[PDB]
Design a protein around this ligand. Structure first.
Ligand SMILES: CC[C@H]1CN2CCc3cc(OC)c(OC)cc3[C@@H]2C[C@@H]1C[C@H]1NCCc2cc(O)c(OC)cc21
Ligand SMILES: CC[C@H]1CN2CCc3cc(OC)c(OC)cc3[C@@H]2C[C@@H]1C[C@H]1NCCc2cc(O)c(OC)cc21
Ligand SMILES: [Mg+2]
Ligand SMILES: [Mg+2]
Ligand SMILES: [Mg+2]
Ligand SMILES: [Mg+2]
Ligand SMILES: [Mg+2]
Ligand SMILES: [Mg+2]
Ligand SMILES: [Mg+2]
Ligand SMILES: [Mg+2]
Ligand SMILES: [Mg+2]
Ligand SMILES: [Mg+2]
Ligand SMILES: [Mg+2]
Ligand SMILES: [Mg+2]
Ligand SMILES: [Mg+2]
Ligand SMILES: [Mg+2]
Ligand SMILES: [Mg+2]
Ligand SMILES: [Mg+2]
Ligand SMILES: [Mg+2]
Ligand SMILES: [Mg+2]
Ligand SMILES: [Mg+2]
Ligand SMILES: [Mg+2]
Ligand SMILES: [Mg+2]
Ligand SMILES: [Mg+2]
Ligand SMILES: [Mg+2]
Ligand SMILES: [Mg+2]
Ligand SMILES: [Mg+2]
Ligand SMILES: [Mg+2]
Ligand SMILES: [Mg+2]
Ligand SMILES: [Mg+2]
Ligand SMILES: [Mg+2]
Ligand SMILES: [Mg+2]
Ligand SMILES: [Mg+2]
Ligand SMILES: [Mg+2]
Ligand SMILES: [Mg+2]
Ligand SMILES: [Mg+2]
Ligand SMILES: [Mg+2]
Ligand SMILES: [Mg+2]
Ligand SMILES: [Mg+2]
Ligand SMILES: [Mg+2]
Ligand SMILES: [Mg+2]
Ligand SMILES: [Mg+2]
Ligand SMILES: [Mg+2]
Ligand SMILES: [Mg+2]
Ligand SMILES: [Mg+2]
Ligand SMILES: [Mg+2]
Ligand SMILES: [Mg+2]
Ligand SMILES: [Mg+2]
Ligand SMILES: [Mg+2]
Ligand SMILES: [Mg+2]
Ligand SMILES: [Mg+2]
Ligand SMILES: [Mg+2]
Ligand SMILES: [Mg+2]
Ligand SMILES: [Mg+2]
Ligand SMILES: [Mg+2]
Ligand SMILES: [Mg+2]
Ligand SMILES: [Mg+2]
Ligand SMILES: [Mg+2]
Ligand SMILES: [Mg+2]
Ligand SMILES: [Mg+2]
Ligand SMILES: [Mg+2]
Ligand SMILES: [Mg+2]
Ligand SMILES: [Mg+2]
Ligand SMILES: [Mg+2]
Ligand SMILES: [Mg+2]
Ligand SMILES: [Mg+2]
Ligand SMILES: [Mg+2]
Ligand SMILES: [Mg+2]
Ligand SMILES: [Mg+2]
Ligand SMILES: [Mg+2]
Ligand SMILES: [Mg+2]
Ligand SMILES: [Mg+2]
Ligand SMILES: [Mg+2]
Ligand SMILES: [Mg+2]
Ligand SMILES: [Mg+2]
Ligand SMILES: [Mg+2]
Ligand SMILES: [Mg+2]
Ligand SMILES: [Mg+2]
Ligand SMILES: [Mg+2]
Ligand SMILES: [Mg+2]
Ligand SMILES: [Mg+2]
Ligand SMILES: [Mg+2]
Ligand SMILES: [Mg+2]
Ligand SMILES: [Mg+2]
Ligand SMILES: [Mg+2]
Ligand SMILES: [Mg+2]
Ligand SMILES: [Mg+2]
Ligand SMILES: [Mg+2]
Ligand SMILES: [Mg+2]
Ligand SMILES: [Mg+2]
Ligand SMILES: [Mg+2]
Ligand SMILES: [Mg+2]
Ligand SMILES: [Mg+2]
Ligand SMILES: [Mg+2]
Ligand SMILES: [Zn+2]
Lengths: 143, 150, 25, 100, 129
RNA sequence: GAAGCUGGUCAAACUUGGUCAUUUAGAGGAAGUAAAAGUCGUAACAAGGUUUCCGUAGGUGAACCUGCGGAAGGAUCAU
RNA sequence: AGGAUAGUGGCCUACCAUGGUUUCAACGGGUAACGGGGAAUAAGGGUUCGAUUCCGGAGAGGGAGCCUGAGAAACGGCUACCACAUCCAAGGAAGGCAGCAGGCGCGCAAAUUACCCAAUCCCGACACGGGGAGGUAGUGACAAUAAAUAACGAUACAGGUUGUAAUUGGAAUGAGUACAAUGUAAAUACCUUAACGAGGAACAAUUGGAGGGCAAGUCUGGUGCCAGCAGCCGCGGUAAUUCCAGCUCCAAAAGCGUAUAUUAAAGUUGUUGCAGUUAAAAAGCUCGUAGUUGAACCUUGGGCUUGGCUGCAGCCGAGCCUUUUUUACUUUGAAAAAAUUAGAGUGUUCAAAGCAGGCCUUUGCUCGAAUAUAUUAGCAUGGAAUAAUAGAAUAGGACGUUAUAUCGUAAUGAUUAAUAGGGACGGUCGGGGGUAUCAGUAUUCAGUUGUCAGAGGUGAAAUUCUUGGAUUUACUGAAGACUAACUACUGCGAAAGCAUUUACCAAGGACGUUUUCAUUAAUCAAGAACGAAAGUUAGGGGAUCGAAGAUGAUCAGAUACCGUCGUAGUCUUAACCAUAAACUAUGCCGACUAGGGAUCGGUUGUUGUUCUGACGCAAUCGGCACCUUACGAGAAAUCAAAGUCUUUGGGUUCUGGGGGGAGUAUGGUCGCAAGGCUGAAACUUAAAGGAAUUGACGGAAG
RNA sequence: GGGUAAACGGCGGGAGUAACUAUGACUCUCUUAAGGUAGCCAAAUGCCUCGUCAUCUAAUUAGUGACGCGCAUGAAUGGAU
RNA sequence: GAUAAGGGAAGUCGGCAAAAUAGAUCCGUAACUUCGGGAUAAGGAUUGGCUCUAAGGAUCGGAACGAUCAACUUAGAACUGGUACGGACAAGGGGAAUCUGACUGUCUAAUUAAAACAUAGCAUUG
């Protein structure tokens, strides 16, 4: 009989069994455990500001061979230290020590993207100016 | 089948379609009743009374002749036992097994069988209590079981 | 490595952890 | 996957079978799994059955046989070519080989 | 154990029809089995059927005419309001023009079209097409 | 009929103790993963060159080795 | 019983009982929890959200106590404490933006210290006053509606009577600006509207992309595993379709991209509707309480009359005649806030909306502002199938409407016995169990005897024992183990497991039965019994093998494989441990679907057979299996179940949700310990994996 | 000649190395035998020594927790609890 | 033998000596554990006098009631006082750890009471 109760009065058993078994679904488990609230560096937010500590080059994973140019950022809201990728050709020259950068994820929702190892965030703005605007010379860095 | 085993045997009796006495049967509905009471006073259980009746008297079924089942007739004549027959034989078997177990402590098979027999006793006694054949406070006690089936 | 020996290695390491914690109870 | 429906032994409707030692290496092998061969060989080789009959003091003396039942593990038997690797479809054939 | 004699009866009918047999034996019988068969027979999905009295639950021999695609029970017998009949017929029947969901209503055991005619509803019991 | 007084009542608040809960330092110890395929060997995959694996128990630089009982997922559906 | 309260009430007091809730989840903990109307997404079923335009609750920095009053435990009221904090002449005094605006701080994250009571309403002694309630404008790409950035000719060409590609014309218009009027409390804007307002109509559309997924380049230059891109797969090492650019093209467009959450996709949470032999996953095996689920059976058929609706039939309703207690469920109804949803009407210029509006032009006439949905619970109601429940068994039973405890009425009252179960009984049948008991040779060790040079072990050796007689030989004895051959695709048991004889003890399946009871049953959280080997504790035994150890070989090294010894152990008695590839890697109960020959146990009928038994031939029930086929299933291997599963529902328990981290850490619990059971997360990762195919290889076979 | 360490007792000296640095996981030979295993430690046992690190204090040759080539720790001369 | 402002071990080799605690009733009690303990752990409240109230029994009489007789215990309340009250007497200080011996026990009468001896348990020998 398919291994689950079918009786008209077995709604409690069906509801409890489903409730027990949804904990095997990591999306449900992460939503109810609040891991983003407790464990995520951003605390569940989409973006987060921070201060650039140092500019660091990270070797890409095999089979790729390159130096992904990231920064070490200390978040203002909680003081945690994260590594954030600086996208596009030469935008590392736009990022200086002790700058305030707005960060966001890579879109893989907490996982590293591509060949970049251990990096889960990217720089969106620096010194309050969009990195895309700086790259395309639409605006200038206030200095 | 086999509540407490994996057997699936189907052997049993097949009652005839006819619900009337055979044409060759000549005894009256009374003479069977006095024969039943005579054997019940000799101490036979209803199963044995029916066995002696068909084996030696041609009474194929006591119901098709007398009109009542054997235990129903004994209860109508005050000869019904206090403990029902099947529960009595189950308790007697449990008494025999427990008595063997106290002398053979390493008989783990007998310990397992005793658990099966006693579970079957408790299920049957629960039924008899729900149908008010046994008192609602009736309980099977291993210590005092030998007295009932003495 | 073989699963049986991996299990044995982990059992010995749990044993060590318990013995180490017992020093300070 | 499953190679044999019999799991390489002959245990059905049974829990445990006591072991036997391989004749060649003394390995413990279940009695149903062991490769067993019954051999009845002449005790005297056919070359010597003549000179021993001539040296015999008895007229019409029958040479006794040698009865033996040999148990092999799978490795003993495969190595000694008592059994050989068969094709996937030929594995199912369990009649004695038609040689005798 | 034996929890649904209607399920056993319909399973036997389905297996005989799938194997091309023109008759099937059902044991045990019951009123629900007979009235389910009467609904199938009235709509032509089975032929004549026969009740055999054995001073017990009984037996039935059904004549099959090859028109039956599938008959089955719905366990459990859900309570069905009139507005739920549409959901059941949508899920169970192959098309909107043929097939029947059998209900047991206080007006009797009947197919969903007759139930709509007399504006009654009960518990779902099975289907046939 | 004011201040005030007696005894109650509701009871904020502080000190100590207990408990619950959430974060965090730490000499040292012991891990995991990622990186590169650096040193030592060759345990597994072929009968992997001692068939492999399971439970258990000893031993050992390391893979691992050995005993006992199992399994075939065997290298035998078979005499 | 009182007190208190506006009043009921352990609301409080006194006395007295010992009660009340809970596996149908109490109590505790968490909530990044105010509840609901609702919102997003949606085939259906669902999943997620709701601080926030309405309703209810609560609070006014945290607590607490009050005054006044009909109404407050009020804070734009007071009192006190705590925390903040203002002025001070140092004696003192005054505070509460979670109202409006505004500031700081916090942060990814959110607007003016503007105008007004004109509207909506409220308050007051009130036609008159007040209202940051509210309205108006400002900021405002939160979302939503409509909708510009051009249109048309002639030449010139190309082209098959017309679609364009260019250089040549005359028209059109609002974006913007503005008299003015309207709007409005006053303005702003909208709507109208003089004059102005378009050729590069510079009055100039952007955001992302062009390897695949995925629509659109194998163009040109630059770089050269760098720089970079790339959600994923991947691109880049000198002709890069992927980077940086130019050209060209593609998609959506006043919008387009990115991050995060969520929904669909996801039948990857599965009630509908998953999977569990081998991919993750059937508990080692039974018992068992709650839970879930449970054979059949009790007014059916017939006859007559009649109402309604669909085109003589058919479909519903009736009404008579035929012997004529509790639920659940389903129908209908009443009562169910608006907004939102669906939906009727209605030219807001269309539309989103709104609830307006329409008439020959009105000293007025006049369609409207529908209707559905809610859904558990409660209320009322029709129906009596399906599923429960009760009744008359020591009769303490029912009727006497007008019967007098008795009497009389009555057909006086008990459903089958399920190829469910339980029990009895009858001949059996088993290597099922326990306790004794009885063999057997072997091994080793010992005693006697006999010879004499080796014996053992190996691929070869060596360790070892040997003229002190080894090894070998016969007889005898003692110890512990173990039960060969017989022995099998055979038996028994819940499994683990069980094999010498006999006795005793208590069990058991199957079969046979015209015996008995009548639902007593199936599966089962909690809770139990048993549970190979190894291991632990303590006695006893310690022949043989033999972890550790010692030793001789091989080897580069092997404290490995091989050889000789060897301690725990192996055996047993009392207890522990609770695990195995505890495997059929396949839960249990029930039904059905296909052929065949064997075989074990029981029973029933029968021989060219040997001597009652054996055998032979037939049936059957139960088992252990096997062979063939594939109706059917499956990814396949394969499967008579792993079939009767998108044509998806017989009952029920357990387990799984990509790979690791990890059966780890932590907490608990059991254990003497070894350890068992329960059991995460951070982080990391694009595969890991299953079955099969071709090849290659193999110290595999032919 | 054999046995015996819960008999007395003993349990060491020597020889090389990892794509920065540091360390050394990586074999045989001698003493009459074996060459210190599990554990534990500047300990009532460590000379150097007031060892080094942490903690405790304003300050600690004291105390505790770590470390360990330990002058000269260590298993019924019983080891660790 | 007593007392001592403020401080409170700065004294000293070292809290030596002294002080502090102390009865009873009620509340509350951690790590660890050989499950027996630790434990009086730690840490709190009360306590007089007087006037009352309630509960707790025996023997007789035929009664869930009467008669007579009788012991000190416990609990509650009011009042009262220079807030005192185990009023003298009597009477634990406590906690976190390390070393060491398991424990109770024993010896150097007359300088050493200990970690020494013994011990149960374990093992060996004849
Ligand atoms: C057990 C350890 C090794 C020791 N060494 C030394 C050199 C050697 C030389 C030989 O030849 C001169 C020789 O003969 C065969 C055997 C040896 C042994 C063989 C053994 C290897 C073993 N593992 C697999 C191979 C194998 C084959 C056998 O036959 C065989 O039997 C004993 C055994 C084996
Ligand atoms: C007359 C008796 C008294 C006099 N007072 C005066 C005040 C005073 C104050 C003290 O300190 C405030 C103090 O300090 C101790 C002692 C005294 C002496 C002690 C003496 C008796 C005493 N004599 C010596 C030992 C002794 C032994 C006993 O058996 C014994 O019992 C009768 C008594 C004694
Ligand atoms: Mg049901
Ligand atoms: Mg059956
Ligand atoms: Mg097994
Ligand atoms: Mg029925
Ligand atoms: Mg119904
Ligand atoms: Mg908490
Ligand atoms: Mg190898
Ligand atoms: Mg190998
Ligand atoms: Mg090798
Ligand atoms: Mg090897
Ligand atoms: Mg070894
Ligand atoms: Mg070996
Ligand atoms: Mg294989
Ligand atoms: Mg009252
Ligand atoms: Mg009261
Ligand atoms: Mg709750
Ligand atoms: Mg909240
Ligand atoms: Mg929403
Ligand atoms: Mg809400
Ligand atoms: Mg909410
Ligand atoms: Mg809300
Ligand atoms: Mg709202
Ligand atoms: Mg509100
Ligand atoms: Mg309020
Ligand atoms: Mg406020
Ligand atoms: Mg306040
Ligand atoms: Mg207010
Ligand atoms: Mg207030
Ligand atoms: Mg205010
Ligand atoms: Mg404000
Ligand atoms: Mg606020
Ligand atoms: Mg423009
Ligand atoms: Mg691009
Ligand atoms: Mg394309
Ligand atoms: Mg190019
Ligand atoms: Mg190039
Ligand atoms: Mg390009
Ligand atoms: Mg992007
Ligand atoms: Mg989803
Ligand atoms: Mg799946
Ligand atoms: Mg596997
Ligand atoms: Mg698996
Ligand atoms: Mg199983
Ligand atoms: Mg069971
Ligand atoms: Mg039911
Ligand atoms: Mg039924
Ligand atoms: Mg029956
Ligand atoms: Mg034998
Ligand atoms: Mg047999
Ligand atoms: Mg079984
Ligand atoms: Mg259950
Ligand atoms: Mg359980
Ligand atoms: Mg022993
Ligand atoms: Mg060697
Ligand atoms: Mg040996
Ligand atoms: Mg033992
Ligand atoms: Mg075990
Ligand atoms: Mg297991
Ligand atoms: Mg197996
Ligand atoms: Mg398993
Ligand atoms: Mg099961
Ligand atoms: Mg079945
Ligand atoms: Mg079925
Ligand atoms: Mg037979
Ligand atoms: Mg028969
Ligand atoms: Mg097959
Ligand atoms: Mg099979
Ligand atoms: Mg997983
Ligand atoms: Mg494969
Ligand atoms: Mg050393
Ligand atoms: Mg050491
Ligand atoms: Mg040291
Ligand atoms: Mg230490
Ligand atoms: Mg010292
Ligand atoms: Mg110091
Ligand atoms: Mg000091
Ligand atoms: Mg120290
Ligand atoms: Mg020493
Ligand atoms: Mg020493
Ligand atoms: Mg002083
Ligand atoms: Mg003082
Ligand atoms: Mg002080
Ligand atoms: Mg001092
Ligand atoms: Mg000092
Ligand atoms: Mg000093
Ligand atoms: Mg000092
Ligand atoms: Mg002192
Ligand atoms: Mg105390
Ligand atoms: Mg002592
Ligand atoms: Mg002295
Ligand atoms: Mg002296
Ligand atoms: Mg002294
Ligand atoms: Zn082998």
């Amino acid at each position: 009989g398919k291994g689950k109760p079918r009786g008209l009065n077995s709604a409690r058993k069906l509801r409890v069994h489903r409730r027990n078994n949804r904990w095997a679904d990591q999306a449900y488990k992460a939503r109810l455990l609040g891991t983003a609230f407790k464990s995520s560096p951003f605390g569940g937010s989409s973006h987060a500001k921070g201060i650039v500590l140092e500019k660091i080059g990270i070797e890409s994973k095999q089979p790729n061979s390159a130096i992904r140019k990231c920064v070490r950022v200390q978040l203002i809201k909680n003081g945690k230290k994260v590594t954030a990728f600086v996208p596009n050709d030469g935008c590392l020259n736009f990022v200086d020590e002790n700058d305030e950068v707005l960060l966001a994820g890579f879109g893989r929702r907490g996982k590293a993207k591509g060949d970049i190892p251990g990096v889960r965030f990217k720089v969106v703005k620096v010194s309050g100016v969009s990195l895309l605007a700086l790259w395309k010379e639409k605006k200038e860095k206030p200095r | 089948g086999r509540m407490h085993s994996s057997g699936k045997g189907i052997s049993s009796s097949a009652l005839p379609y006819s619900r009337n006495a055979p044409s060759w049967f000549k005894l009256s509905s009374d003479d069977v009743v006095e024969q039943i009471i005579k054997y019940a006073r000799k101490g036979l259980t209803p199963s044995q009374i029916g066995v002696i009746l068909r084996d030696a008297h041609g009474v194929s079924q006591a119901k098709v002749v007398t009109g009542n089942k054997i235990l129903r007739i004994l209860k109508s004549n005050g000869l019904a036992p206090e403990i029902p027959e099947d529960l009595y034989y189950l308790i007697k078997k449990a008494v025999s097994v427990r008595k063997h177990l106290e002398k053979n402590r390493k008989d783990k098979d007998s310990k397992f069988r005793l658990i099966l027999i006693e579970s079957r006793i408790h299920r049957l006694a629960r039924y008899y209590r729900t149908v008010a054949v046994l008192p609602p406070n009736w309980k099977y006690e291993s210590a005092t079981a030998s007295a009932l089936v003495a | 490595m073989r699963d049986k020996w991996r299990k044995k290695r982990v059992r010995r390491l749990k044993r060590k952890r318990r013995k180490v914690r017992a020093r300070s109870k | 996957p499953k190679k044999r429906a019999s799991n390489g032994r002959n245990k059905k409707g049974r829990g445990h079978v006591k072991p036997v030692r391989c004749l060649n290496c003394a390995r413990c092998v279940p009695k149903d799994k062991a490769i067993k061969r019954v051999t009845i060989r002449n005790m005297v080789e056919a070359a010597a059955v003549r000179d021993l009959s001539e040296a015999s003091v008895y007229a019409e003396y029958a040479l006794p046989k040698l009865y033996n039942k040999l148990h092999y593990c799978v490795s003993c038997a495969i190595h000694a070519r008592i059994v050989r690797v068969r094709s996937r479809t030929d594995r199912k054939i369990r009649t004695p080989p038609q040689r005798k | 154990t034996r929890t649904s004699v209607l399920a056993d009866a319909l399973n036997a009918i389905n297996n005989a029809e799938k194997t091309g047999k023109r008759q099937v034996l059902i044991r045990p019988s019951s009123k629900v089995i007979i009235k389910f068969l009467t609904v199938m027979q009235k709509h032509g999905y089975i032929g004549e059927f026969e009740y055999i009295d054995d001073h017990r639950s009984g037996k039935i021999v059904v004549q099959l005419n090859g028109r039956l695609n599938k008959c089955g029970v719905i366990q459990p017998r859900f309570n069905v309001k009139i507005n739920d009949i549409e959901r059941w017929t949508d899920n169970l029947l192959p098309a909107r023009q043929f097939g029947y969901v059998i209900l047991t209503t206080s007006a009797g055991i009947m197919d969903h079209e007759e139930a709509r005619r007399k504006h009654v509803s009960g518990k779902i019991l099975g289907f046939v097409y």
